[PDB]
Write a protein that binds this ligand. Structure first.
Ligand code: NA
Length: 121
């Protein structure tokens, strides 16, 4: 139908805007601490600690499949990255500190993305 096409074009455009959002957030992680899944070879007990692992590569896969239906879903996954890190790692670690910086710097990006998504529909 024409409506299914129109809905598909809206999802494509959302995907384009979330891709730019993801690029901007990942720039706030220049050490690449959150770029890939935590390695189960190297942290073999990780899944005993963290039930829903997340990282930027995994988000990018979902994004390119048009798997985010709205900005809320995308923010949920970003928040897992931060929140998982802040639980597994102690406050005095490079990892925890990197997550706090990512959260603080990403807040700005996500604030305007919410306005852009509401504005463009
Ligand atoms: Na902790």
């Amino acid at each position: 139908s024409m409506e299914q096409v129109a809905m598909e074009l809206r999802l494509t455009e959302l995907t384009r805007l979330l891709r730019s959002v993801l690029d901007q957030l990942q720039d706030k992680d220049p050490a690449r601490i959150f770029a890939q899944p935590v390695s189960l070879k190297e942290v073999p007990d990780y899944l005993d600690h963290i039930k829903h692992p997340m990282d930027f590569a995994t988000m990018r896969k979902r994004l390119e499949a048009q798997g985010y239906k709205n900005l809320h879903e995308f923010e949920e996954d970003f928040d897992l990255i931060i929140d998982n890190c802040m639980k597994y790692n102690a406050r005095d670690t490079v990892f925890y500190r990197a997550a706090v910086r990512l959260r603080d710097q990403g807040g700005v990006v996500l604030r305007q993305a919410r306005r852009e998504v509401d504005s463009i529909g």
